[PDB]
């Protein structure tokens, strides 16, 4: 009972500690690629002109 | 009667399994038949088709019929295996560090005999690779001369095929000694474009056993050898593409002719086999811009093509003016002197693709000469 | 975190289990070697050791060789733990006495030891998935021993059967009417919910929709592997609505005796017809109610639906699901019992179904329906009548009674199945009070 | 938003529909692999008239392809645009058609009807607002006659408020490709009169007349014969798919072309028809196009329009043109020959002009004429039936499969009862 | 051999590549073929055994073997 | 390990052993010397079942060859795979039965029966889960008929849990082969009905028909007829050896066939049997396999099922095949020919599939069926004893040997106490 709650609490926070880091990295990488999307969009506008 | 059978795959844009089919070309009158291997039924009954030619039928070649694009993987049956089997021979031809100026003539004289062209590199050979290349004459008093010539200028490596292509390319080579070729005068590549028997124009394997090790040394299977002699950052740089069309009918040496006679400095060549997702990145700035982006995509990946870097010279006229407009029929009347004016037809099947926007220049150069081997 | 332990009994259950674990490997990206080509969704069916060697959370148990040896000689040799696989040395041979009473004690201690070893390294045990047949001696009696022990040891847990129901017309045995009544009588008290599956119903499904007039048992087993993949996926992936094994057993089971639903699937299309079809959520829901996509040969029009669970997976619009439910709650070909107006339970997952190299198609939508209906009394009555006509003058009784099993359990199982057939009728009867 | 369900009954109807789907897939920009490559975004506005969408943007035809012998389905599948159709809609049958209306209406044909109506009903239910059905078939012969007319009867029974278009091939006076064309065609017309709304009659000798005198060809093929019909079929339903001014759908064509409910027999026509030798010297304008339509050599049934009064005429132009040209040119036609137009219907011509032309071409026009001259095409078959029926010949098959002398006489009597008003309204 | 168009002529002409052979002094037919012939089996008694069981023919090690839906410039961008 | 002993006794039975062990050596790999020059690796695994092991790849067969006169013993040592049977497992005694069950079960046998038992134990123990012995005797005649029954008996006790299958040569119908056959074989029937678990009756006469009708072999030798029996002896144990879906252990072929205990006299039969000349034209497919199996001519025992019925039947279909077919063709047989099937036991079949075809084939099957018509067989044999005992014929020996007139009677009744059960249920 007590060790039963403790074990899954431990596993809970253990994969929390890494899902934290790589989710934040994924969000920042999405921001970087949408910045590059803005770059190629103005690039296309120049090509159209 | 007298039918030709091949086995092919097609990647369907829906469900991702490779559809396995059976292609059948009739040379008596140009007709296509396809059978299905998975379920033994019919597929596209025997119908006339005046866009498929005999030279397109080759192993590993990339053939388009009814927008259902095929790639060939087997020789059908033993009959056409005999007909186009021991015929085809793979050979590695080498432009020397000399006659790189007249590279187009040599590409053209391979193109004359029907020697179909599959891989193309322009590399400055490394120090370590030279002694691998010099196995044919190892430990004889010619290593210093042959090293000093070979590891001096950029060489151009060549994969070639036709029947008994070994001895047919030796027949283009003529005598091995270029001085002997001049004294004999048989109309060989050294007899027209040589200097001497250590710097002639071209020499490679003498048999298939040596052709195997030449192939492995110069075109590796995972790839490390050619240092990709491009000089990517050279400011006045432009990347253009001799299209899979112009490669298929065979215009590469003549394009090299037309561009070097204007003083523009060719700095890098490579043939790369286009795939769809990779064509999207080189033509990334075109979707939405041109209302027929899809035909440009399928013309790019409808076959092998050579990327090349051109260095800007010949003042006033830039490469955009040397190639002129986009459509060859725009260019035929308006500015009637461009390479896109008269070296190519239609609009789908143009000769070259330029960098269009200026800044957008080192990008292409990098794509096909840095971020893609 | 959220794991369910799979047990697979008999030659049948082991081959279904091999299909299930192949499809689980292709879902979670597990290669047959055991490693992963480099998220935590794999911790429902595959465990984790250092220097990653993800090992299945199952046991394949069988009383005779060549079936488990087929698995360890095949292409999944390195993936399975050696003691995970259990081999006997003497075949049960279609006898419930040789499944329950004589050769079960030579392996039940080792099987329970391995179940304990698996359950020790399992923080959340959402239940056991029991794959077995109502046919052979192993899958008939060894399962009865298994539930008898698991009711004692893990009595608060959930047990979900995926039984191979006997063929109502063709069959492969004469003692299936014996084995079916005996294992139903023993496992009726100890089961929580049992989805039954008919082989010749899947033959009809394959010949009509999958267009394979030459189907094998691998083709047969891959579809039921996809059934359990649809059912045990919400505790693996995330989605719109989360559904669990306990939630299944408490939604599909009105009465303690009545725990016999029927499984069915949608897109059963064969990779040359799935792209000329709209394949909308409404029509993949409508394909489940037709009396031809059912996995058991039993007409729903000859009965009343008591509960249904619709499990949707893929690019699924829940409001399109809701409109489909509103459309199918109107027509009079489908009737409910008068005491279950809220009969539909929805579970949506955000994972489109995978395909193995084989027979099914790339589908971006799928739905598995678990419909508990009183029509299955008709299918019970056929093998009930078979049991009467078979027991009229004591055919094949000598093996069972001489192996050690008492004679009176035939009458006990007969009366229990008669009581179950009696139990279904007033539940199906409309209320008048 | 409108949809039309396509049906092909018989071999002839099957190749005509195959060339139809090729031609309109060319016009809408559909590849044989199901995806889209095209040049105009105006083509996708009404793609859900003939094509139902699927997963991944793979447009499939809303067509059902039925025959009593599985030797035309594999030919259609092995055509260039073969695997665009739904394989469940390939409703075949391992039997023999036997070119017999009895075996198409009361035998294996009627046994296969109960299965083909399932996919017809599915294609009807998978639409928001269906408008019409179109059926490609041939009277002369079986399947397209027997199963075709029985499909017309059952679909009219199930959907009584929707337009029924039928593109029907009638036997020629020059030859006969079988020997039982009158026997099939009379029982065909007897069902087709009190059922469908727009019969469009096509004749093979008229096709050869067009292909030799107008188009100047020396070896025309069945691709050519069905291609003219495919161009007509695309140009009838084009105000509904492509935009413009004075749009006209099929029911508006029906209400402006059918004065009396039985009188719905039409002779189609397509007239930007240029030979290769005359294409360079051509002077393509609306004053040319109207004269080419009203020239009585391009009419795709072997009936002479100078032998009877036009009841109603409809013209669907396609292209950027002026309604000055259109309206006043069609008026000068009506005034140039007024004895060949009826007086009990004044201003008896209908104009519908699309903006989008057929691909490659600039100004097209499709002609549909309700006229008296269908009386020749019908009386001819009537005396052919009297000649072949006074001696009871070729009849034991019908009497064995379940036909009756009384209903054969009923079919002939109904053919005469429609030969009556075409003379009555032509002689006032 | 058979050499006569009495009964069993077809099978007398057949199987002499198998039956009608035994040296010169092997002794008649029944004295040397008393342990039987190569019947039952069709015609190929040195044919190899099949070892292509259903588990191995239906559970072969799978793979993707498809074109990569991954642009190269993407691959460098997300990797960097 | 489920190993299987192959007790074989009697000149006749021993010859059957030879060709049996040949089929097994062939379907496995054991060469006429021993070294396993086997090709695939699915055959060397389950060798235990029938083949043992010995330093040097040598796989001495776990067989027990017995006889009462060193005659065939030697003819086995030298001939086929002779030099493979252990020199010790060739137990033999100097005398001769003489076609008299007596010497076989009381005087002669007694001497050898004791020693033979020793060989068995030395071999048995070695097996892990000894699946169970299997004997090939010869009711019609001596030695086996007598010695065999005595062994079957004494060994049924020592180990009271091992299916003792017995492929026996029951006296043929017409042409006889021994005058004492009647009396002799009857004694055996008695002993067999209450000692053996499941026997399979084979009639040399029956196989003759199957050899000059289905195999059109001009001059059939006993060796040829022997191969057919050996093949059945292989098909019944296929699963216990090679892999396969739906395996079938010997105990199962019984548990799913034998209804009441006593009733255990079935009828064996191979399946893919075509002329050595017309084989290249054979369309081997489940349909044709089941046709040639549940037929009649292709049953290795004179007992036309048509004149009787069928309690339960099995079909060990070896070969990679689609069970849908197996299942359906099986049901077709049951449904169509219902009369030739009892109703008290529903589902009267035993689909069992392997995964390895008999070397040089694709599919194959072995029909085993409890035809109630095995009565006609025991009837003939009984209508012979009562045709003899009555006139105290050829009885002196038996009596003088040690048997008692009374004993003979017991058998007659026991026989008719089995020639009757198979009728009560065999008519319902
Ligand atoms: N999907 C699938 N179903 C099977 C398979 N094998 C058997 N079945 C079904 O299961 C029934 C009998 O199989 P089992 O209960 O496993 O037989 P068993 O438990 O191994 O017992 P034994 O026959 O004595 O070996 C058959 O009627 C089939 O319907 C299989 O390999 N795959
Ligand atoms: N326009 C056109 N007409 C055709 C074609 N093929 C056949 N026909 C006509 O169809 C008539 C016979 O068709 P029919 O026998 O009824 O086909 P069925 O309905 O399948 O039996 C012939 O007289 C032909 O003139 C075609 O490809 N195009
Ligand atoms: N199938 C088969 N039957 C045989 C063979 N040899 C003998 N028989 C049968 O066995 C019967 C007599 O054998 P028997 O005298 O009892 O031999 P014994 O056991 O040594 O006394 C004959 O009727 C034969 O039909 C054989 O090699 N194969």
DSSP F304-324: -GGGS--S-EEEEEBSS--HH
Name the experiment that determined this structure: cryo-EM
F416: helix, strand or coil = helix
Q: Name the closest ligand to CA C196.
A: 1
* Nearest-Cα residue of chain B relative to residue D41: B291
B9 interfaces chain E, CB cutoff of 8 Å: no
Start-end of H helices in C195-273? 199-205, 217-231, 245-252
Which numbered atom of ligand 1 lies nearest the CA of C91? 24
The DSSP 8-state label assigned to residue B84 in this structure reads T
**E-chain residues within 8 Å CB-CB of B278?**
71-72
Taking the CA of C64 as reference, the closest ligand is: 1
* Interface residue D122 vs chain C (CB under 8 A): no
Query: What does the block give as tokens for C396?
Result: 């094949």
Show the 3-state SS of F238-300: HHHHCCCCCCCCHHHHHHCCCCCCCCCEECCCCCCCCCCCCHHHCCCCHHHHHHHHCCCCCCC
Q: Name subunits touching C (3+ CB pairs < 8 A).
A: A, B, D, E, F
CA dist C126 and C143 (Å) reads: 19
Strand partners for D231: none
Ligand whose nearest atom lies closest to the CA of C222: 1
Does residue B285 belong to the interface with chain A, where contact is any CB pair within 8 Å?
yes
- Give burial (CB, 10 Å; 0-12/13-18/19+) of C232: buried
How far, rounded to the nearest angstrom, does the alpha carbon of residue F315 sit from its chain's CA centroid?
A: 16
Single out the catalytic residue among B203, B245, B333, B353: B203
Closest CA to D74 of B16, B44, B373, B113: B44
CA atoms within 13 A on the CB side of D345: 21
CA distances (Å), origin B303, targets B277, C26, C58: 14, 34, 50
Instruction: Quote the tokens at residue C86.
Output: 């259990």
D222-236 and D10-28 helices, crossing angle to 10°? 60
- Name the packing angle between helices C318-328 and C281-289 (round to 10°): 40
Q: Could you tell me how many residues make up chain C?
A: 433
> Ligand 3 site: residues with CB under 6 angstroms?
F 10-13, 15-16, 97, 99, 138, 140-144, 169, 177, 204, 222, 225-226, 229
- The token pair at C372 is 């508990």
Q: How far is the CA of F11 from the centre of ligand 3 (A)?
A: 6
Catalytic residues of C: 247
CA angle F405, F406, F410 (to 5 degrees): 120
H-only helix segments in C165-216: 176-190, 199-205
Burial of C226 (0-12, 13-18, 19+ CB in 10 A): buried
Residues 30-49 of A with CB under 8 A from B: 40, 43-44, 46-48
In angstroms, this model's resolution equals 3.7
At F123, list the tokens: 């071999």
SS3 state of residue D195: coil
How many C-beta atoms surround the C-beta of residue A23 within 10 A? 10
Pocket flag, ligand 2, residue D99 (CB < 6 Å):
yes
Closest CA to D155 of D348, D367, D4, D326: D4
Using the 8-state DSSP alphabet, how is residue C311 labeled? E
Subunits next to B (3 or more Cβ pairs <8 Å) are: A, C, D, E
Residue D81 is encoded by which pair of tokens?
């645009």
Secondary structure (3-state) at D8:
strand
Residue having the nearest C-alpha atom to atom 24 of ligand 1: C93
Structure tokens at F179: 């005058």
Nearest CA distance, D342 vs chain C (angstrom): 49
Alpha helices in D69-107 (DSSP H): 73-77, 101-105
Of F40, F228, F270, the CB nearest to E51: F40
Q: Write out the two tokens for D378.
A: 């019908």
Nearest alpha-carbon partner for C302 in C334, C259, C340, C260: C334
Task: Of F72, F298, F136, F300, give the one whose Cα is nearest residue F204.
Answer: F300
Does C15 sit in the ligand 1 pocket, CB within 6 Å? Answer: yes
Regarding the beta carbon of C217 and ligand 1, being less than 6 Å apart is answered yes
Nearest C-alpha neighbor of C276 from the set B14, D134, D115: B14
The dihedral of CA B127, B128, B131, B134: what is its sign?
Answer: negative
- Token pair listed for D394: 């070729």
Residues 6+ apart with CB under 8 A from F35: F57, F58
Cβ–ligand 2 distance for D329 under 6 Å, the answer: no
Which residue in B6, E5, B160 sits closest to E13, CA to CA?
E5
F101 in Cβ contact with F184 (< 8 Å): yes
Compute the distance from residue F310 Cα to the ligand 3 centre, in Å.
28
Please work out whether the CB of residue D188 comes within 6 Å of at least one atom of ligand 2.
no
Pairing of strands B155-163, B70-74: unpaired
Mutate which: F360, F363, F364, vs E, most E CBs within 10 A: F360
Q: Which residues pair with D202 in a beta bridge?
A: D169
**Across-strand partners of B11?**
B18
CB distance C12 to ligand 1 below 6 Å: yes
Decide if D139 contacts D189 (C-beta within 8 A).
yes
Contacts of E77 in chain A (CB under 8 A): 33, 36
Residue C103: CB within 6 Å of ligand 1?
no
The β-bridge relationship of strands D244-245 and D265-270 is unpaired
Cα dihedral sign for D140, D141, D144, D146? positive
Please check whether residue F47 is in contact with residue F59, taking contact to mean a CB–CB distance below 8 angstroms: yes
Q: How far apart are CA F314 and CA D4, in angstroms?
A: 58
For A39, A43, B281, B297, the CA distances from A46, given in Å and listed in that order, are 11, 5, 18, 21
Question: How many cross-chain Cβ pairs, B to D, lie less than 8 Å apart?
Answer: 40
| Whether residue D11 has its Cβ less than 6 Å from ligand 2 | yes
Phi, psi of C345 (to 5 degrees): -125, 125
* Closest to E33 in 3D by CA, of F232, F220, F73: F220
- Angle CA F247–F250–F253, to nearest 5: 80
Question: For residues F342 and F428, is the Cβ–Cβ distance under 8 A?
Answer: yes
Other Cβ atoms less than 10 A from the Cβ of F116: the count is: 23
Q: F229 to each of F167, F175, F198, F199, F225, how far by Cα in Å?
A: 8, 20, 16, 13, 7
Q: Does the beta carbon of E78 lie under 8 angstroms from any beta carbon of chain A?
A: yes
CA torsion through residues D12, D13, D16, D18, sign: negative
Beta strands C365-373 and C305-314, pairing class: antiparallel
Measured between CA atoms, how close is C293 to chain E, in angstroms? 24
Annotation says B203 is catalytic: yes
Q: How far is the CA of C116 from the centre of ligand 3 (A)?
A: 59
Q: Are F112 and F68 in contact (CB under 8 A)?
A: yes
Which one of E72, E75, E78 would you mutate to disrupt binding with B, by most B Cβ within 10 Å of its Cβ? E72
Q: Residue F201: name the closest of F384, F403, F380 by CA.
A: F380
Q: Whose CA is nearest to atom 31 of ligand 1?
A: C12
- The set of long-range contacts for C415-418, using a CB threshold of 8 Å and a minimum separation of 24, is C416/C184, C416/C185, C416/C188, C417/C181, C417/C184, C417/C185, C417/C380, C417/C384, C417/C387, C418/C384
Residue F247 beta carbon below 6 angstroms from any ligand 1 atom? yes
Query: Of all helices (H) and strands (E), which one includes residue F112?
Result: helix F108-126
Where does chain B have alpha helices with state H?
78-83, 103-112, 127-133, 143-150, 165-173, 178-184, 189-193, 208-218, 244-249, 252-260, 276-282, 293-300, 319-323, 328-333, 362-367
**F107 CA distance to ligand 3 middle (Å):** 21
A12 contacts in C (CB within 8 Å)? 1
Closest CA to C272 of C214, C365, C366, C359: C359
What's the start-to-end Cα distance of chain C, in Å? 47
Q: How far apart are CA C404 and CA C391, in angstroms?
A: 19
Atom of ligand 1 nearest to the CA of F246: 6
* Residue D16 in contact with ligand 2 by CB distance below 6 A: yes
- Closest residue of chain E to B15, computed from CA coordinates: E66
To which H or E segment does residue D136 belong?
A: strand D130-138
Strand bridging mode F65-66 / F8-9: parallel
Q: C1 and A7 in contact by Cβ < 8 A?
A: no
Tokens matching residue D48:
């859900």
Among residues F24, F16, F85, F11, the alpha carbon closest in space to that of F237 is found at F24
Taking CA atoms only, the protein residue closest to ligand 1 atom 17 is: C136
Please choose, from the candidates F341, F165, F314, the residue with its C-alpha nearest in 3D space to the C-alpha of residue F253. F314
Q: Which two tokens stand for residue D335?
A: 């005034």
Q: Is F335 helix (H, G, I), strand (E, B) or coil?
A: helix
Measured between CA atoms, the residue of chain D closest to residue B13 is D56
Where are the alpha helices (H) located in F297-385, listed in sequence order? 323-336, 374-385
**Using the beta-carbon criterion (under 8 Å), do B289 and A43 form an inter-chain contact?**
no
Contact list in C for residue F323 (CB cut-off 8 A) is 215-217, 220
Query: DSSP class of residue F147?
Result: I
Distance F170 CA to ligand 3 centre (A): 10
Question: Chains B, C: CB contacts under 8 A, how many?
Answer: 10
Proportion of chain E in helix, strand, coil states, percent, rounded to 5: 20, 0, 80
Q: Give the integer Cα–Cα distance in Å for C119 and C393.
A: 46
d(CA C236, CA C1): 10
Q: Do C357 and E62 touch (CB under 8 A)?
A: yes
The answer to whether the CB of C95 is under 6 A from ligand 1 is no
Residue D58 touches chain B, beta carbons under 8 Å: yes
End-to-end CA distance of chain A: 71
> Residue B9 to residues B81, B297, D201, E66, F45: CA-CA distances in angstroms?
18, 20, 45, 11, 40
């Amino acid at each position: 009972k007590s060790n039963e709650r403790d074990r899954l609490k431990a596993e809970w926070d253990q994969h929390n500690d890494r899902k934290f880091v790589d989710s934040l990295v994924k969000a920042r990488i999405k921001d970087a690629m949408q910045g590059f999307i803005i770059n190629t969009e103005e690039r296309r506008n120049k090509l159209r002109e | 009667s007298e039918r030709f059978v091949f086995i092919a795959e097609w990647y369907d844009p829906n469900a991702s399994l490779f559809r396995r089919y059976e292609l059948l070309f009739y040379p008596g009158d140009g007709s296509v038949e396809m059978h299905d291997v998975k379920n033994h039924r019919t597929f596209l009954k025997r119908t006339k088709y005046e866009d498929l030619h005999l030279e397109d039928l080759f192993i590993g070649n990339k053939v388009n019929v009814f927008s259902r694009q095929l790639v060939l993987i087997d020789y059908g049956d033993q009959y056409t295996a005999r007909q186009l089997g021991s015929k085809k021979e793979k050979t590695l031809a080498l432009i020397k560090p000399d006659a790189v100026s007249k590279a187009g003539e040599i590409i053209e004289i391979i193109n004359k005999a029907g020697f179909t062209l599959t891989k193309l590199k322009m590399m400055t050979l490394s120090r370590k690779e030279a002694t691998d290349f010099h196995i044919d004459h190892q430990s004889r008093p010619f290593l210093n001369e042959l090293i000093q010539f070979i590891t001096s200028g950029p060489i151009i490596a060549m994969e070639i095929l036709r029947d008994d292509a070994i001895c047919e390319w030796k027949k283009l080579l003529g005598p091995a000694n270029s001085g002997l070729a001049r004294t004999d005068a048989p109309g060989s590549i050294r007899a027209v474009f040589g200097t001497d028997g250590i710097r002639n124009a071209a020499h490679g394997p003498d048999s298939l056993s040596c052709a195997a090790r030449e192939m492995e040394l110069f075109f590796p299977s995972s790839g490390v050898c050619g240092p990709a002699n491009t000089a990517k950052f050279t400011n006045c740089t432009t990347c253009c593409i001799v299209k899979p069309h112009a490669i298929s009918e065979g215009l590469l040496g003549k394009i090299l002719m037309a561009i070097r006679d204007a003083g523009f400095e060719i700095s890098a060549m490579q043939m790369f086999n286009m795939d769809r997702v990779n064509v999207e990145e080189f033509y990334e700035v075109y979707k939405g811009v041109v209302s027929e982006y899809n035909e440009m995509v399928t013309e790019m990946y409808s076959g092998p093509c050579v990327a090349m870097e051109i260095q800007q010279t010949n003042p006033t006229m830039t490469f955009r003016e040397f190639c002129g407009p986009a459509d060859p029929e725009i260019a035929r009347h308006l500015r009637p002197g461009t390479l896109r004016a008269i070296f190519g037809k239609t609009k789908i099947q143009n000769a070259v693709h330029c960098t269009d926007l200026p800044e957008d220049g080192l990008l292409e150069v990098q794509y096909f000469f840095k971020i893609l081997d | 975190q959220r794991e369910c332990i799979s047990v697979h009994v008999g030659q049948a259950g082991v081959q279904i289990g091999n299909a299930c674990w192949e499809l689980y490997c292709l879902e979670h990206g597990i290669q047959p070697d055991g490693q992963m080509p480099s998220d935590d969704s794999f911790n429902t069916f595959f465990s984790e050791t250092g220097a990653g060697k993800h090992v299945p959370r199952a046991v394949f148990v069988d009383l005779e060789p060549t079936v488990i040896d087929e698995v360890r000689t095949g292409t999944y040799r390195q993936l399975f733990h050696p003691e995970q696989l259990i081999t006997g040395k003497e075949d049960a041979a279609n006898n419930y006495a040789r499944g329950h009473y004589t050769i079960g004690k030579e392996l039940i201690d080792l099987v329970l030891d391995r179940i304990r070893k698996l359950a020790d390294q399992c923080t959340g045990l959402q239940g056991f998935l029991i794959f077995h047949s109502f046919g052979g001696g192993t899958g008939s009696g060894f399962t009865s021993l298994l539930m008898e022990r698991l009711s004692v040891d893990y009595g608060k847990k959930s047990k979900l059967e995926f039984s191979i129901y006997p063929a109502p017309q063709v069959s492969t045995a004469v003692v299936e009417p014996y084995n079916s009544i005996l294992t139903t009588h023993t496992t009726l008290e100890h089961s929580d919910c049992a989805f039954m599956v008919d082989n010749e119903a899947i033959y009809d499904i394959c010949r009509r929709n999958l267009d394979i007039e030459r189907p094998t048992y691998t083709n047969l087993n891959r579809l039921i592997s996809q059934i359990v993949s649809s059912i045990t996926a919400s505790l693996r992936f995330d989605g719109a609505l989360n559904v669990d094994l306990t939630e299944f057993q408490t939604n599909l089971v009105p009465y303690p005796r009545i725990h016999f639903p029927l499984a069915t699937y949608a897109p059963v299309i064969s990779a040359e017809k799935a792209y000329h079809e709209q394949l909308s959520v409404a029509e993949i829901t409508n394909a489940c109610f037709e009396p031809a996509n059912q996995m058991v040969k039993c007409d729903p029009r000859h009965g009343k639906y008591m509960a249904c669970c619709l499990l949707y997976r893929g690019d699924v619009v829940p409001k399109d699901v809701n409109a489909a439910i509103a459309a199918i709650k109107t027509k009079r070909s489908i009737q409910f019992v008068d005491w279950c107006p809220t009969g539909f339970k929805v579970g949506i997952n955000y994972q489109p179904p995978t395909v193995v190299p084989g027979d099914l198609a790339k589908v971006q939508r799928a739905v598995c329906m678990l419909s508990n209906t009183t029509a299955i009394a008709e299918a019970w009555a056929r093998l009930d009548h078979k049991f009467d006509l078979m027991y009229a003058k004591r055919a094949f009784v000598h093996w069972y009674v001489g192996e050690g099993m008492e004679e009176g359990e035939f009458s006990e199982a007969r009366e229990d199945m008669a009581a179950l057939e009696k139990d279904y009728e007033e539940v199906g009867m409309d209320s008048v009070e | 938003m409108r949809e039309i369900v396509h049906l092909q009954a018989g071999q002839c109807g099957n190749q005509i529909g195959a060339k139809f789907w090729e031609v309109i897939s060319d016009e809408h920009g559909i590849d044989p692999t199901g995806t889209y490559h095209g040049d105009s975004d105006l083509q996708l506005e009404r793609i859900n008239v003939y094509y139902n969408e699927a997963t991944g943007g793979k447009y499939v035809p809303r067509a059902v392809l039925v025959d009593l012998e599985p030797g035309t389905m594999d030919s259609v599948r092995s055509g260039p645009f073969g695997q665009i159709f739904r394989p469940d809609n390939f409703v075949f049958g391992q039997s023999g058609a036997g070119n017999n209306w009895a075996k198409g209406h009361y035998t294996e044909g009627a046994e296969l009807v109960d299965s083909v109506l399932d996919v017809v009903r599915k294609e009807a239910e998978s639409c928001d607002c269906l408008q019409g059905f179109q059926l490609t078939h041939s009277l002369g012969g079986g399947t397209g006659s027997g199963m075709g007319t029985l499909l017309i009867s059952k679909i009219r029974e199930e959907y009584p408020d929707r337009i029924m278009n039928t593109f029907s091939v009638v036997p020629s006076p020059k030859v006969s490709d079988t020997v039982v064309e009158p026997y099939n065609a009379t029982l065909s017309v007897h069902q087709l009169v009190e059922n469908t709304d727009e019969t469009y009659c096509i004749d093979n000798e008229a096709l050869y007349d067009i292909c030799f005198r107008t188009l100047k060809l020396t070896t025309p093929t069945y691709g050519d014969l069905n291609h003219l019909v495919s161009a007509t079929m695309s140009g009838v339903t084009t105000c509904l798919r492509f935009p413009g001014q004075l749009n006209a759908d099929l029911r508006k064509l029906a209400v402006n072309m059918v004065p009396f409910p039985r009188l719905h027999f039409f002779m189609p026509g397509f007239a930007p028809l240029t030979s290769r030798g005359s294409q360079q010297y051509r002077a393509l304008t609306v004053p040319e196009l109207t004269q080419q339509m009203f020239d009585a050599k391009n009419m795709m049934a072997a009936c002479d329009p100078r032998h009877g009064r036009y009841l109603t005429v409809a013209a669907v132009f396609r292209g950027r043109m002026s309604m000055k040209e259109v309206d006043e040119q069609m008026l000068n036609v009506q005034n140039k020959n007024s004895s060949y137009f009826v007086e009990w219907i004044p201003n008896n011509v209908k104009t519908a002009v699309c903006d989008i032309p057929p691909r490659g071409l600039k100004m097209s026009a499709t002609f549909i004429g309700n006229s008296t001259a269908i009386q020749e095409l019908f009386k001819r078959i009537s005396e052919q039936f009297t000649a072949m029926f006074r001696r009871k010949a070729f009849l034991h098959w019908y009497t064995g499969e379940g036909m009756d002398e009384m209903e054969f006489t009923e079919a002939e009597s109904n053919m005469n009862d429609l030969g009556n008003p075409v003379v009555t309204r032509g002689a006032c | 051999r058979g050499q006569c168009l009495l009964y069993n002529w077809e099978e007398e002409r057949a199987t002499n590549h198998l039956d009608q052979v035994p040296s010169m002094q092997d002794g008649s037919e029944s004295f040397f073929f008393r342990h039987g012939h190569q019947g039952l089996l069709t015609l190929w008694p040195q044919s190899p055994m099949s070892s292509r069981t259903t588990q191995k023919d239906s559970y072969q090690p799978p793979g993707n073997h498809s074109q990569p839906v991954r642009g190269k410039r993407e691959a460098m961008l997300e990797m960097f």
